[model samples]
Target: MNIFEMLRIDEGLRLKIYKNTEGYYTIGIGHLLTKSPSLNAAKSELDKAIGRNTNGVITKDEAEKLFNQDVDAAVRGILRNAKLKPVYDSLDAVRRAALINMVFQMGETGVAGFTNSLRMLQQKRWDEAAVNLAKSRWYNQTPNRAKRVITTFRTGTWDAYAAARTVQRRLLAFALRKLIGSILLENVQPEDIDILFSKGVLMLSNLQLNCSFLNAVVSINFTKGTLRRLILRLNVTDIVNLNVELEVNGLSLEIELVILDNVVEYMNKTASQDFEDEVINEGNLLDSILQKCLASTSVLMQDALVYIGRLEAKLDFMSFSSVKTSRLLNINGITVSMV
Candidate 1:
């Protein structure tokens, strides 16, 4: 039940260039490519992300990097506002997530304009805060997403994911932005997004996967990969069975070089779950059914990717050293085989 996972579904992930609701050229989880010090700098960031020159495409890891920075900026903006500190401190994790989501979607200045709503939230007048939130152009333009955010504010619960279930059916298809984006490195059609929401399982075919893992510069590249899937199912008792499948034309695992024990130790220390949880708290279950679905493949993917990011960041920090800073992993393919 990570807030970022919820926001990913709500904001939708786009590795390629596309216009946001406001016609701003945006990419990588609502990152505005247009709002920057310079359009060229933004485009350069985009280019640097994908490791290529152009064509407006980005890997999921690249997009994820941008998303993290954007989220950090939003959080800082909210904290620096001075007026939001007391109210922000007074709220629970769920309510705080709702506030962060608001600032993440709209800037701090935009959220700051919701004076009445902020007041109601500070007073713990949930209903009044929700009503105040609804009386905005933001709601009018993206009512569905806004409705879920408002519900979170009203209930101080994770009910927003459930509230957005139907919408998630559409957006959930892109929930693989982390996994699939890594392999495809291209644009995905809205209609061609996915199957996790409609079915308990998800499936992807005709994709590729490339990754380097563990030690010794160990790397694997699966070319002509055709099928990759994840199967997750629940019984009446609510136990989960998780399995991963892969179909590829060629399999190659290469240990191109040696990675020292200290490098591995450093990676483990930096990318530990405790470190990640400090920033992105785990999702809480206020309902059995909603919580079950929320805990499926998307949560797994988010955790895995976040750690990979931590590892990536560590490698970057250690750059200009002996360790080769090549990407540690790339995953592509889709599908969930529920049964």
Candidate 2:
């Protein structure tokens, strides 16, 4: 549906300039004429209309046309001034329309000033763009209209900003958790791991973004025979130490094991079943033959196939980054994709 038509209903078509919902001297749906135009000047402007309403009465159709022109100038001017002509041309309709709507809210200059938002969109960081848009002063100015636009950009849904953003925020967080779990449930390349880790960590700087990272330690008890499993217990302790340095986007993660002091050693769990049988079968006097064949160490290596999984960095991340930071929220803070 055309947004201007809704503007017609919301702003109400008027032939003469009058104060609008936002206390602006608006006319022809949402066409803001001027703050304090003289009566004669206002009538003169209306008199030159395509469908001149001599009596200061405008047709609904005329209002729609005028609004469309505003939308066009707004859209074009924003794309040009924002320096996003190349990027804007390649965006999908949903995202493309989102920029148009944002432009419609603020004129070209208004949206052009959104440097950070423009930066995020330029890189096609859809989520970051949405977060930036929502935290902008524009959103604060008119949360009513901005909510719809924000929700559309965030979820690709139109006219579905009925619920408050808090609900939507939680839902997005849940979806991200599910998405991360799904990603880790299967095999993932180290490159992909690096991207997610960096993205989540960087987002912590923005108070609006929520990041979840988890860290845990597990101790397993092992024995001598073909040890199939280990008695393991987990502790949610601080990351003893994490060493890293930046490369392309961020640093890589490494897990260190204190072998002798902490972990119990048993025969390597990978021994063939035939080998296990041979070692066990050679008992008492039979051990004499096996001892000659292999140099045996009493302390064996243990394997559970159970590995540690978690990115356990803890932090009270900011949401919108400012002099005033956010509080403790987003329980997913400590839960990183150790998987």
Candidate 3:
């Protein structure tokens, strides 16, 4: 008779066993036998059987023996027939072992049922495989265990996975700084400051900064007609909020620019001639003055517009037209746009 028939459980209990134990009799017994009246006798018999089977070793083999023949057969079938061998072959020993343990608890069919993961692996797409593995129902169901497994795969350092997460955070912070610096200091327009500031600050906050970025202000002297010159010093952490301060004829102006990580979004507005020339040499001398300033500061005339915008409110007039005008600016960085 089948184990379920031998146990004399009703169909409802049988179905319950099937659902809870995934149709594996040994798994059902491993669970049900704990609550059975015959547990003591079964345990004693199992101890003897396992002692003989494994030469007195305390192991799963012992548990199997205690579970009886039908259950033992079922357990062996599940373990030996598990399709996880392919997934196991794809991973290092540590990750493979962890996956194996998870499968052992869930069964071969249950573990192999990760369709998306299997598909990604079959396509030899390692990145997609990693993503799919992370997004699996199994992984979602057991977050701590899944994170441990993913960390091992990502860094190839199983022992220090927890520490690796901290290091990963630092790397992300560095990347965000470089990104914000590039954006804030790029040639941009005045009207674009709102979008830049809003988007840039939001991105920085998401990156979780260890140190806040500080704004720097420097004086530009153009009385010598040698072009306006200002010095802005930036620390590794101050790239995000790096604002510019301009003092022209003792009139102070401060402006915030858009810095997306480190890439400047609106460049033309921040470095406009109309804005900078208003302080030093009013009128169209913007190009000439900007050219001279560019030579002194070693910053392009276009970039000077972005710098000047950060120092003064001149960016208030920047429109989309400004962004279209500054095309030479390019910086290496990543931005988080709406999903």
Candidate 4:
């Protein structure tokens, strides 16, 4: 997950203007609209962001637009700060997110006041920085949010990514049960899924496979299978991009194919020109269908940002396909990248 989704979860969405805990007028995704400026000016800015006269109420899309602008401003503010620029640059993605979130909520000047904490963060003393944060009035004012950030500061783990990983694990397990029922070689559990993802590297052997194709007229069998090594690593570069590195080694599948007499007859008939036209037409149709799937996946992943992240095979496989025959295929390896 990106900073946008993380911050949204931290600071809930509001369509209309509301007074924050500190009595500042706020709107949209925790956007501090006005302190002493005239209400008319604030309204104009809000309407400008939304590109319409919202009458103090905004649509979710408009709110998100305002959120992006506010976040961009916060990013610029942090980068512009003389003392914070090095600190920001030195941080990893998760730590940078914590710093950015704090800056977004408290403003650059306010965050700049945390001299000790900033020094500690710059030194990469995570525990010291978290302790310094706990001593601040900001922590006391909103302990839950502060604690969340503190945990990130201390552990250097993105809570939002962790949460998504957990949800994905459970969803895959549920989907596996629904699709495979009793025929699976082993029990499908979140722990097993977690091991496959979080272990970073894995190896397995002595696997067998049986699959059918072309409406069961052709069958493929593997007497013995071995995967020597598999590696998956997810690296989040910034607020927008997540990169994944994956490798597979020594994948051996001894294959055999069984074809029926009707398959040859079908292949002979498909040699005609009409069949080629039909294939081209079906390719276009499939393209449109996949575009819809891409649209939905983009929403789940969010925004225009592309993710070169891994979508665990078990999770995406079960959710994406409806063919019961795929259960027998048991395709446990797949590579996915978003554009």
Candidate 5:
């Protein structure tokens, strides 16, 4: 029997643009319709590869040729990655076909991940190999397709590999985490406000007299004049990307109320004679501002914490029935950056 016949019966043929099982636009049998950096570049390459821009029209005959080329590529890849070229000619037809098909579906690297399964196959432990392949992340993602492959593993019908679950949440989260790291604190600091060691030192000086008696400070803005942009960006890559504007405003009214006594008043009167009165007054006001801000940086922590909490909640929510994912893309999570 012709192997082409067997494959055609198994995978079926398609001529027009249709989504594959994992939802990637496909044409020319099961050839995935993908772009390079741009769609036009992809078209030019496709024109060269498929004897035309068969990203659209592929005749049945053309599809068969495409299929043959793919099979050869898969064969070459398996031979190289598994280092089985020397021994391949001696393999039984059934084993060759099964292993080759497994290579076809998984490509070289994917099949390589099944180290134990491959070893079991070498030992002629078909059922053990089948079980090994079935109890996998792939199995969990697309049970039915994996079951088909599992059947082939059990029967050795040249175990097949098809794209399973469209998205891999764990793997997706990891990528997002990487992107989050890419975001710079410089960029993340709201309003071009510097968060890192711009000036990079802390120096504190004390007053000569312990002038404790002072009226609670007036409505003095702490961060308003001295500070700059306090920006927050929640950019989550949830299968795609979710972006939102994060704005936060804050004041230290409560701290101002608590520390308001004659503290400001005594500082106004008990300054050095050497310095101008305006300089002394401004210096004392600045001290009061710093004190209140120290007491109220709590607002900073709370808002950012709350924002992240909301983002996590969105992830769990948007994660519901994620059908928009492209083919064989297993990723779920957000990438956060400060810059």
Candidate 6:
């Protein structure tokens, strides 16, 4: 049945499906209402309610009204949480709708505590903001839901593109992991890893693949300022063999990982030279070195990714899509598909 027929409302309660497939919307009461009811019983109750309320004509307006009464409060509560407020505030109406769609799938807290994306939002960088939004752990975990939200954000209108984007992202991520995993586990040579990284970067640069694969690869180059300061942290040295790919007009460029420490030894040895004497008094020579190291690492990686992309082909390495996606995926583990 259509959205209207499935979302019929009666009295204070509205009937809607906990699931939908194709154009048919399945109907079930909320989890709060369905703690004990069997699926068949829930369906029967929903059918009976629809028959009573609409005389068998569940209009879109009625369906939406029912949805508002039944589901909106739970959704609004989710949006109001401290973590999600920024997302709600930053998003336009279409983006908000996308956020609501995510709330429907994963609950508020699940989407709200999206640390990396939230951090990007706070910085007011729209391109990276969009990149981070698409690169959630949730996206990799629930490809369909992630695709729907991302398409909604991009086109400013949700249509058939939503489903298509989701499926595309899932398939691309699957293919990439298959390719990358083969290189990692199979008797592939080190050069094979380079090839895989190049191919992956090409896919990402072209927006042909999802962001998770790119983010996973880019994360190897992430340089956090302090390990103890953050609750969830990674030490840079663990990334022994990071591989990244940039796809530009179907041309792949590979990037090999070289930890920052290996690249600039003088930065480590003469760490105190770049800092203010007062700042040095506040911390220490080692702290100054570490701070400079982190900053230098970020700049070098950013420059290196762009340089490699340009060298491989005459592509624009500094395109917002390219630089932002590469940095975000590398630092945060999110991916995107452009519509």
Best candidate according to TM-score: 1
CA RMSD of all predictions = 15.8, 28.5, 26.8, 19.6, 24.6, 23.4
TM-score of 1: 0.52
**CA-lDDT, candidates in order:** 0.52, 0.41, 0.34, 0.54, 0.40, 0.38
Structure candidate 4, residue pairs in collision: none
Q: Mind giving the per-residue lDDT tens digits that candidate 1 earns over 201-288?
A: 4344444333322332233332222223323322212122211222222222222222322322333343333323422452211121
Q: Model 5 reaches what TM-score against the true structure?
A: 0.40
lDDT against true structure, model 2:
0.41
- For residues 71-107, write the lDDT of model 4, one tens digit per residue: 9999999989988888889999888998898899889
lDDT of 5 by residue, 111-153 (tens): 6777677667666687877877788876775466567656655
Mark the regions of model 1 whose C-alpha exceeds 4 Å error after superposition. Answer: 36-55, 163-339
User: Candidate 1, overall lDDT?
Assistant: 0.52
Better of 2 and 4 by TM-score: 4
Query: Which of the predicted structures, 2 or 6, would earn the higher TM-score when compared with the native?
Result: 2
The best candidate by lDDT is 4
Give all TM-scores, in the order shown.
0.52, 0.41, 0.27, 0.47, 0.40, 0.32
State residue 254's C-alpha deviation in candidate 5, in Å: 86
Model 2, 250-329: lDDT tens digits are: 11223334321111111112122333454356422112112111111111112112222333433222121112111112
Q: Which ranges of candidate 5 are over 4 A from the true structure?
A: 33-45, 83-91, 140-142, 156-339
Model 1 / residue 288 / CA error / Å: 29
Instruction: Summarize candidate 6's per-residue lDDT along 51-149 as a digit string, tens digits.
Output: 553322232334344455545755576557878777667776666666655565456666667767666555645566667666667667646546655
